[PDB]
Amino acid sequence: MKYILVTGGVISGIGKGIIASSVGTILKSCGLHVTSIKIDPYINIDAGTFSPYEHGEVFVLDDGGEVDLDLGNYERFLDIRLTKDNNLTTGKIYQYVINKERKGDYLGKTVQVVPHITDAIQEWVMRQALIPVDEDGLEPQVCVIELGGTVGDIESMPFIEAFRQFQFKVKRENFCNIHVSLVPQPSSTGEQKTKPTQNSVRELRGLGLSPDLVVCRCSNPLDTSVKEKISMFCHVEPEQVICVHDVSSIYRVPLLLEEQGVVDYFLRRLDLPKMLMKWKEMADRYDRLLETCSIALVGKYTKFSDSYASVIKALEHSALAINHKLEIKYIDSADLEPITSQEEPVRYHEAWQKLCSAHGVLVPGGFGVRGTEGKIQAIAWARNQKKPFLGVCLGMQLAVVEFSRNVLGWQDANSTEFDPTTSHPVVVDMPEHNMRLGKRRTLFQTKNSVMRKLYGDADYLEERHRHRFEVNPVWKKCLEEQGLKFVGQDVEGERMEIVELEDHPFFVGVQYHPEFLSRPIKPSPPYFGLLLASVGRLSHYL
Amino acid sequence: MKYILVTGGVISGIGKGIIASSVGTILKSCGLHVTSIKIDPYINIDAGTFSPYEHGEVFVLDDGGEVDLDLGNYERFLDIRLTKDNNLTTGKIYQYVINKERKGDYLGKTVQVVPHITDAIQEWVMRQALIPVDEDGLEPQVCVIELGGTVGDIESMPFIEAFRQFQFKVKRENFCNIHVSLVPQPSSTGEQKTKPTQNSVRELRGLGLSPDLVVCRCSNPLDTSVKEKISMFCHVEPEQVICVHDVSSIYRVPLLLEEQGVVDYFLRRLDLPKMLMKWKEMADRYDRLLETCSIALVGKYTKFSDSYASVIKALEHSALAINHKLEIKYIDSADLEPITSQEEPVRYHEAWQKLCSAHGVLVPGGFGVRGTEGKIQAIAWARNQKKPFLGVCLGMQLAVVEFSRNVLGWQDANSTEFDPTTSHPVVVDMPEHNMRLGKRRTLFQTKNSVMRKLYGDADYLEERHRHRFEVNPVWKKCLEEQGLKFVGQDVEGERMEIVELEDHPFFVGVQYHPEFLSRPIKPSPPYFGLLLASVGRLSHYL
Amino acid sequence: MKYILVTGGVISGIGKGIIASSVGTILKSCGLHVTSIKIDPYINIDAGTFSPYEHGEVFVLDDGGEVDLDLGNYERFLDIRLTKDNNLTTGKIYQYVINKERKGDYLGKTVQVVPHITDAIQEWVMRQALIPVDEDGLEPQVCVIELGGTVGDIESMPFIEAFRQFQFKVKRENFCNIHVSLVPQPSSTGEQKTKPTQNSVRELRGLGLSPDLVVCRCSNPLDTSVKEKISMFCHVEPEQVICVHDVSSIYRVPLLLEEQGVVDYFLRRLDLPKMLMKWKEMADRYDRLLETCSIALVGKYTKFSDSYASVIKALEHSALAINHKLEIKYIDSADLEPITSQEEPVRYHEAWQKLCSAHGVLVPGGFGVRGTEGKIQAIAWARNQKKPFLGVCLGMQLAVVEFSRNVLGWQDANSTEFDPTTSHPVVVDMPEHNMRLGKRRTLFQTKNSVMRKLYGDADYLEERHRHRFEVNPVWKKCLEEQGLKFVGQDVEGERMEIVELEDHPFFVGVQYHPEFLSRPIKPSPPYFGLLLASVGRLSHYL
């Protein structure tokens, strides 16, 4: 096995997960099988409890692991299928060591941070680094470990101490460490200041790791004097300091690391034996593209961009496949609510100006009441104005509620997530009996859905879910005698998984999250359908 | 005595010297007498060896101390007269303790970093904090100590350990600590990231100082969530975290600290008993000003703004006194050289486009050959085109060389600093016999100089010098029978200190550095003369 | 060059200077030329100011360097001749870097702890490691650097940081690090506790040095479980942990390191190509010896054993050469004073019981009044009772005072060090005109001195001095017409360097310090003379 540890220097949210992914695409381009581990020093067992404002959206794996969005950056770049335990946490590690102590497996000896926690971290890294994550059952050859947080955080020190031991448990050709650090450049002075990178390398060295690369993150490229100053004080050779400046899209980061020479580094550093050309082409297309498309994103969590991270990537993959610039008009759905118009009318009219000037609309997934009435407002707009619509998870449920309120005329209709008093309870709590969570098979129930044609006319699809709630089979017929067709359903037909509306340019609900299976050269079919429909090309594609 | 220690967090060049000066103006505005110490953790005894690219320009004190430019920020804001030993260094401290050990004053005991170096730091701070630096012989009441560098630099630790002891040598009402730290905000995310400030406060706490204020330096104001996060992790009350965002001029920093409430803090923190209005007025005038003046700065050291720091402040004081915006056209003097035109013609024509479009020209001081021929080129332009001219130190010497080459016609004429082969050696090496260094008295030798009128028609002036070279008294008469009048000279008349040219709008050489005595409401008369002349108002002022 | 850095772990005064010397004898036994450097992190330039209670006695080198007593441990074991600069201090380093900055040799750049102090430490170590210190002008092959103090002392960190850089400035075969640490064993528990060694290795690793040997200092040998626990937590192989338990004499430490296997370590660790047998023989003789001799040591500084360290070694070398156990009766000379008898009579009678039961007496060197009258009391005893006497430096001066007071009858006679009012000023302040300090040549002025016979009947000897005071040539004749013969004098005959008394078994004064040239198989002739005389064998030897 080869192991690459990517450590964070001065801040988190620095791009360290794009460096870890870019290194994984460079090694993938050398023909190697690549896997990844995200270490999150937090004490949570999984991401499944998080409010989307903490660390961005919750990504879902094939096995139903609710994980950090960095597991989505690895899957997008490497086109792998990670498992629950490729996210490693101090919660998962202390729970594992604690259960192993209660079972008596430490043979009546005292269990400690060193050795016993740091041994469990090294066991876990080796155990996961051997699991096949490519499309073939081939063992990985290199494992990129990204350590979340920054060095010298108290939560991080068990992992830095575990990798301090690991770099001698394995021969030097098998372990390498990249340190990703900030080089700030304040407006008052215009010097790029290297001191925080010097202190960060000195902390990493003081915890017993020598960085094999220093990756300086800065807004614009290093001056040679600043790159030589880093070399003097960080005790690293001039070709061994990399700058990753702000690029036009993340597809230029593998190519920026290739210009800075890391491929010619890892081949001599790790005793190793064309595909960067597709990242080159994609990046050069993205820079060349010149006419816009615009999607309204009718978000609940609209405070931060990272709260819709895989959705924004699925819209960008689809826009690059249809050769358009993408303008995501971010709308806080609470501003579409008619209660906002009574007291915050400048927010109400800004949201509606954005929603009306959009070429198509996306109602993404979510949980709990806040913003729901604005999502229903935007679906009603999309029906009546005939604007192309994608409803994801919550957006399918709220399309069934909207069609109940304003097509069947059931003005009291709601999901029983949001109002459990409701008569006409058209969406219902419906758990698993083994939450419809992780990968499941959907079967098509028709030949002639536009979604069946976008999915390439196989009789099934396999897709990933979060939800707890479903379309009620007592009210299914009352929706089907009118304009909604539940084109996709589960293997037993108890659950509605895809809905399509009659006599609308494109209006689809999906119960799963298509964005998790979007890949840079292969957009998820629903997001491609919305992009095609909003530029008018969905009729030509069929 | 009261003591305020200002510490730097994440980078140096953060504005920590403007915070230390602003705190000094707030305490000055509470009617207190204020003094300052700059601690430089470097091993240099003084700034007198530095190339101006290291830590900016060399400031000169009344006593001839060559010191850091922060001693100039204190003098500009507090209008004090600091001494050589208000700059404290590890060089000065280890030399002091080493001489004290060789003299036997440590009584045959072993001398150590603790106690003996840390005791000498506390002795020195107390000794200097009692020296009168105001215009009256009044003892200071508060001493602002600024610690240069950042916390957790190996050079800084003797001083952090000395102040850890000091905060218990004096009662709590007498000692207070401000920590100035960076809060970066990367373009990729737009979160203000507080982690480096948390780590910096945790380092300062770990070295045994609790910050009484945390001053967050950021490009734009803190969100309340980010200010509350700093409070949680830095263990500091919400009103005790200050943001100092990027302001339009440094005159808004005392007022920004007043809005953020530090005056209402120090009055309760330090057991203490109108003038911010003049900083308010100056800042509001500077924002209102609307028509430009432009000075060409014919610099040697033009790579960095901080290399002409007191000169830029003297031009800004003069421009605010004549009510104009100032556009300093920074010219690297080497680009005016006719050798540049042979191989770098785009640099040559850019420099000459800047020099010709300037309303007046400043040739500032310096040392050694490089760029000298471009300074002579610009003085020749200023004579022939009749553009207003100020020559400072080197610029007076090169005005006497220029007038020799192109008015007397002595084409071989040079300073013997630059060419010791020279016939007609019009500028000569001439040391002191006690370098004409520090404050000295100049006497006027005439009634009717425009410089005597700008200096308010006293028969003498007292000004500060760096130089080693002077105008040769063997060639003085040959210049005086033509257009140069040496209007100002030393008490014995051996040295030429001011020169004025006949039949030119304003063309003056000064041998001293006027910029060191510029104060925000009182510009130095030569820089005011250049500003008045270049906008045409010097004729009206007389 | 090869370099061995010996670092101290938990306490100083651990035996780290005997490990550094023992490693030097092992490499000497492999036929290598060996040199040593003592680094003292203290700020003193030299040991010449120290009260003998700080760090023990002041050792004098051939060149007149007043240095630490570890430079004497190296000279005794390696039989080398070290120079002033083989003692390196933060005083000497900061003075060297400070003078180099004032001379401008750092080219107008800022001087720092890193690089400039840490570079000067590496320059100095390389510069001194090449100086010949053996009897031939042969370049050293290995340099043992001992770092005084303990790791993680604030004074030590410049040197740990300099050796962190040095271990990569030179190839791995050329640099090796030994860490000497305490393993305490408290009476309440009887576990040998390894935690302070784990923390000390973790501090040394955290400062960036990996210990190539861990030398555990404990009262009795490590249990194998305790040696294996050190290996687990200190990350060091079981054969790479050494115990140096308390031995019967220091001659067993090279042999204890040989049993523990360090010779078979350095030969593979440092790429290297019988004499331990003489240390084996000496140690086995010392254990076998069975009948005593006893010397009264009439000390001023008698509070601590280390205050007479080279004197105790010179007495032990002489006792091992005459095949006796040595019982040094340590007497505080102030207790022999007749003023003590008036108020502390149990101290007075204990001191006199010790002095009378001694077989011979040594009055060692010193400075200043306190204890002088007790040294005169013991010399008067030694004359009148005919007990063998050695007076060293101060003891020669006080023999000339004693013979004045009680043989010439000049009851007011004193040294002018102690009473400058004195009539008959028989000892006088007499500086050098180039202090008679370092090595000087003494010439014999006679054929038939017992000291000339003990020195092997060469017409000169070369010996090392501290003193400022001498026997007065105005009173020389008045002493020579009676029983004192000044048998040894300087090259010009102005100074008395050796004195012998007529009709006494052995009564000699020496003005130099013979103890500094004592070597384990070659005692200094005066100390051998005292040992021979006190067991009666000096008559047989002649």
Ligand SMILES: Nc1ncnc2c1ncn2[C@@H]1O[C@H](COP(=O)(O)OP(=O)(O)NP(=O)(O)O)[C@@H](O)[C@H]1O
């Ligand atoms: N070179 C770059 N230029 C511009 N944007 C970038 C660059 N690299 C990464 N980004 C974006 O910057 C943001 C931060 O990247 P990310 O990789 O998520 O940070 P991280 O440090 O890895 N966070 P954490 O998971 O909290 O430890 C992401 O939205 C990236 O897509």
Ligand SMILES: Nc1ncnc2c1ncn2[C@@H]1O[C@H](COP(=O)(O)OP(=O)(O)NP(=O)(O)O)[C@@H](O)[C@H]1O
């Ligand atoms: N709030 C502010 N907004 C914009 N510019 C500022 C602000 N405060 C200070 N500056 C300017 O920022 C630069 C850095 O200030 P300075 O006070 O010299 O940094 P410093 O940390 O004090 N440097 P050092 O002396 O090297 O320890 C100076 O040119 C200031 O004039």
Ligand SMILES: Nc1ncnc2c1ncn2[C@@H]1O[C@H](COP(=O)(O)OP(=O)(O)NP(=O)(O)O)[C@@H](O)[C@H]1O
């Ligand atoms: N193995 C041992 N057993 C018994 N005594 C010893 C042993 N090793 C050394 N000693 C003695 O212990 C004392 C301490 O040794 P020394 O080598 O002077 O300590 P150090 O740590 O080297 N001191 P410093 O010079 O202050 O950094 C000396 O008197 C040695 O002679």
Ligand SMILES: O=c1ccn([C@@H]2O[C@H](COP(=O)(O)OP(=O)(O)OP(=O)(O)O)[C@@H](O)[C@H]2O)c(=O)[nH]1
């Ligand atoms: O990718 C990850 C994963 C997990 N974590 C975990 O979250 C903890 C907090 O790491 P943060 O990056 O959030 O630092 P902060 O909140 O203290 O300051 P900000 O810059 O964010 O304002 C980390 O110490 C780590 O345990 C991350 O930080 N990043």
Ligand SMILES: O=c1ccn([C@@H]2O[C@H](COP(=O)(O)OP(=O)(O)OP(=O)(O)O)[C@@H](O)[C@H]2O)c(=O)[nH]1
């Ligand atoms: O105001 C001062 C005075 C002195 N110094 C002294 O200069 C040393 C270097 O402090 P720097 O601020 O120059 O840090 P750096 O050069 O290592 O990295 P950059 O951000 O500058 O690229 C400090 O450790 C301190 O000893 C300052 O830094 N600032």
Ligand SMILES: O=c1ccn([C@@H]2O[C@H](COP(=O)(O)OP(=O)(O)OP(=O)(O)O)[C@@H](O)[C@H]2O)c(=O)[nH]1
């Ligand atoms: O051999 C030497 C030489 C010099 N020094 C210098 O003396 C300083 C003090 O080192 P000490 O060993 O004396 O420690 P301490 O006095 O603080 O506590 P004790 O165990 O001695 O009671 C050290 O930090 C170092 O600078 C030594 O300690 N040992």
Ligand SMILES: NC(=O)CC[C@H](N)C(=O)O
């Ligand atoms: N992730 C989602 O959007 C789930 C949709 C709905 N709240 C549910 O929880 O069942």
Ligand SMILES: NC(=O)CC[C@H](N)C(=O)O
């Ligand atoms: N500071 C200066 O400009 C000095 C001018 C000239 N070089 C001199 O040194 O004398």
Ligand SMILES: NC(=O)CC[C@H](N)C(=O)O
């Ligand atoms: N070291 C000594 O004993 C010196 C002896 C005498 N005090 C002198 O100083 O001259």
Ligand SMILES: [Mg+2]
């Ligand atoms: Mg990340």
Ligand SMILES: [Mg+2]
């Ligand atoms: Mg400053």
Ligand SMILES: [Mg+2]
């Ligand atoms: Mg020692």
